Amino acid sequence: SGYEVHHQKLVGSNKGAIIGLMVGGVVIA
Amino acid sequence: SGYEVHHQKLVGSNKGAIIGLMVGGVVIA
Amino acid sequence: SGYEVHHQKLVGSNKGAIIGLMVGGVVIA
Amino acid sequence: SGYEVHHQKLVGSNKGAIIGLMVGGVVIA
Amino acid sequence: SGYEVHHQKLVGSNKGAIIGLMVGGVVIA
Amino acid sequence: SGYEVHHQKLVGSNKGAIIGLMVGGVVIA
Amino acid sequence: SGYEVHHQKLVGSNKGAIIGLMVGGVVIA
Amino acid sequence: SGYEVHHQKLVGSNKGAIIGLMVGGVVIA
Amino acid sequence: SGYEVHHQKLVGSNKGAIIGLMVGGVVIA
Amino acid sequence: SGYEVHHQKLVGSNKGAIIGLMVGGVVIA
């Protein structure tokens, strides 16, 4: 038991939000 | 128990928000 | 128990916010 | 228990905010 | 218990803000 | 007869293409 | 006959392409 | 007959391309 | 017959490319 | 017949490229 995020690959253009793990807070994309 | 984020690869152009781990706060992309 | 972020690689152009770990505060990308 | 950020590599052009760990404050990218 | 940021490498051109650890204040990139 | 574009006002954040008049060429937004 | 662009006002943050008149060429936003 | 661009006002932060008139070439924003 | 760009006003901050008239070449913002 | 750029005013902080007229070459901002 726990939370984890691993081994991913992203390529190209970002203009929004990219987030690995979110435990709280607010994201206006 | 815990939170972690590892071994990821990102390539190219960013104009937004990229975040590994978010525990609180606000992100206007 | 804890929070951690490791071994990631980023390549190219940034004009936004890149953040390893966020525990609070505000990010206007 | 604690917060940490390690072993990451960044390459290329920055015009925004790059932050290892954020515990508070404000970031206008 | 504590906060730390280590073993990262950054290469290329900066015109914004690069910050290891932020505990308060304001960053206009 | 002719082409013209006038008296417009834009306010806020741009991350795409804003073009007054386009007679040819290519725009990847 | 002709092409023209006038009297416009833009305010705030730009991270993309802003172009008055485009007669040819390529724009990667 | 001709091409012209006049009387515009721009205010704030630029991190992209701002161009009055473009007759050819390439713009990577 | 011709190309011209006049009477414009820019205020604030720049980290990209600002160009009055472009007849050729390449811009990497 | 010709190309010209006149009567503009620029105020504030520059860290990129400001160009009146470009007839060729390359601009890495």
Numbering used by the authors:
A (entry chain J), B (entry chain H), C (entry chain F), D (entry chain D), E (entry chain B), F (entry chain I), ...: 14 to 42
Excerpt from the paper describing this PDB structure:
Tg-UppSwe transgenic mice express human APP with the Swedish APP mutation (KM670/671NL) and the Uppsala APP mutation (Δ690-695) and their brain pathology therefore consists solely of mutant AβUpp(1–42)Δ19–24. We determined the cryo-EM structure of AβUpp(1–42)Δ19–24 fibrils purified from tg-UppSwe mouse brain tissue to a resolution of 3.2 Å. Murine AβUpp(1–42)Δ19–24 fibrils consist of two identical, intertwined S-shaped protofilaments that pack against each other with an approximate pseudo-21 helical symmetry. The ordered core of the fibril, for which atomic model building was possible, extends from residues S8 to A42 (Δ19–24). The S-fold of each protofilament is formed by two hydrophobic clusters around residues (i) Y10, V12, Q15, L17, N27, I 31, and L34, as well as (ii) A30, I32, M35, V40, and A42. A hydrogen bond between the carbonyl group at H13 and Q15 in the same monomeric subunit stabilizes the N-terminal arm of the S-fold. The interface between the two protofilaments is formed by salt bridges between K28 and A42' of the adjacent protofilament. Interestingly, murine AβUpp(1–42)Δ19–24 fibrils show a high similarity to human and murine wild-type Aβ42 type II filaments, although the sequence register in the N-terminal domain is shifted by six residues. In conclusion, the murine AβUpp(1–42)Δ19–24 fibril is a hybrid between type I and type II filaments, combining structural elements from both. The observed poor binding affinity of mAb158, the murine parent of lecanemab, to Aβ deposits in tg-UppSwe mice may stem from the inaccessibility of its binding site, spanning amino acids 3–8, as S8 is part of the ordered core in murine AβUpp(1–42)Δ19–24 fibrils.
The Uppsala APP mutation (Δ690–695 in APP, Δ19–24 in Aβ) is the first known multi-codon deletion causing autosomal dominant AD. Discovered in three individuals from a family in Sweden, this mutation gives rise to a dominantly inherited form of early onset fAD. Post mortem analysis of Uppsala APP brain tissue is consistent with typical AD pathology, showing abundant deposition of extracellular Aβ plaques, primarily composed of AβUpp(1–42)Δ19–24 or an N-terminally truncated form, alongside intracellular tau tangles. To summarize, we solved the fibril structures underlying the tau and Aβ pathologies in a transgenic mouse model and a patient carrying the Uppsala APP mutation, the first known multi-codon deletion mutation in the APP gene leading to AD.
